[PDB]
Amino acid sequence: SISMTTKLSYGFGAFGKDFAIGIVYMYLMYYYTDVVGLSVGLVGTLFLVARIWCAINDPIMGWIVNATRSRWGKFKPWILIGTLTNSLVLFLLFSAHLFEGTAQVVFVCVTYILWGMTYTIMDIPFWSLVPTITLDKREREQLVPFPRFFASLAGFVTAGITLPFVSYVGGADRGFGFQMFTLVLIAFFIASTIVTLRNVHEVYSSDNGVTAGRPHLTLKTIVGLIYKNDQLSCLLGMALAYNIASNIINGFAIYYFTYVIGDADLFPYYLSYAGAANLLTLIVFPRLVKMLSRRILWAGASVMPVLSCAGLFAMALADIHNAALIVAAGIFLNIGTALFWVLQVIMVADTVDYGEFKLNIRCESIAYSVQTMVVKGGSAFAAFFIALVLGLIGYTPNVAQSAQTLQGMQFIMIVLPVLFFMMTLVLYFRYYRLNGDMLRKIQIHLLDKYRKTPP
């Protein structure tokens, strides 16, 4: 029933959506420090505060999107505004190398936080289009792999050709090449936004006379829809734990690839094989959901990175530091993250549907606001837990540290993501219920309701 054109246009939309932020996530540290000359402490504090601010802003953006009424619906206008304003703020962000002194710092602080906010404006409604397109289990399963694959491909093409571009254009003057590549990103992002706005046509969307929308809602009642929707709360917990675990693992990988190994011959192969695994598991997700249960795929999504953690734990117990083990851990982690993200989008859709069922309110913006809130709070809480463990083990900041202290810090860093994954799976298998006959019950209920309600 889903137009192949719709799948591919939403995929290109996701490509442009993530191709504009991968550069930030991946090289804003290197820009701010190696090009602009700012203290690592300042940059880290800014990143933490901004992630907290975005997490708090997310539900406000959900309230805004839900209470919106326009010609193109309640999502497309905010999608366009977000893309445009975020492109502007991105270019301004990577133009920080011009100023100096307090003028620079202030600039850097404004742009960055604005960027965050702006992207939030763009992010929530985009994904909220998913539950308004299908409403069916298999259709969602074979829909969301397109955008997830395209997001991952954007991230990996960034990691691949973002530095060669900055080097070719400008040369020496790294800020200039950065802003030129930024313009490239702006072009792709706006093209993708136009594509998704024209082609993606929301079907079962709030705004429709039959879809049980309640636009005039308070912030109190809307944020209460999160707690009242017990399944959306389960999703909140699951995704928060999974994001904390994956952020801790990614920070460990960054630390051991940037500072420790020093063998620059490895990271290319690690990235290549990780991207291969991720894109392959995304391509083959429509298959294997029928071959293997939805629950089974969630379990595997969290278990594969647990295998990666165990492998690198064995690696740390010795000092072999085998590159084969590194690439295997990366492959497993990437398979897990792909499965997780696909199932997570499908589950946000399922949860907005279950909210319309249990309650009588349809609200996609809030569920995907929860998604983005959790995406940001994951990094926030991972940093919090790492600082907690450091203070507990007595990690003086960048001063001489015992050998066993460092090895134990590494071991506990390996361990606690396993705890978070066990938490995700406990919560899933004990409280989640949207994978079987329940899903079809919700579907038939909503479809019959729409059929009976006067349009």
How far the N terminus sits from the C terminus, by CA atoms, comes to 21 Å
Number of domains: 1
Which value, in Å, is the CA radius of gyration?
22 Å
Instruction: Let me know the largest β-sheet.
Output: none
Question: How would you name the CATH homologous superfamily?
Answer: MFS general substrate transporter like domains
Gross geometry: globular
As a percent range, the share of helical residues equals over 70%
Order of helices and strands: HHHHHHHHHHHHHHHHH
Q: Supply the CATH architecture.
A: Up-down Bundle
How many helices in DSSP terms? 17
Structural class: mainly alpha
What is the CATH T-level topology? Growth Hormone, Chain: A
In total, the number of strands is 0
Strand content: under 5%
Task: Please identify the top-level CATH class.
Answer: Mainly Alpha
PDB class: membrane protein
Keywords: sugar transporter, MFS Na+-coupled transporter, membrane protein
Assembly: monomeric
Entry title: Crystal structure of a ligand-bound cation-site mutant D55C of a melibiose transporter
Lay out the secondary structure.
Layout: H1 4-19, H2 22-36, H3 40-66, H4 76-93, H5 102-128, H6 137-143, H7 145-168, H8 174-199, H9 219-228, H10 230-260, H11 267-283, H12 286-289, H13 294-317, H14 323-358, H15 364-393, H16 403-431, H17 437-452
Helix pairs in contact: 1-7, 1-8, 2-8, 3-5, 3-15, 4-5, 4-8, 5-15, 7-8, 7-11, 10-14, 10-15, 10-16, 11-14, 13-14, 13-16, 14-15, 14-17, 15-16
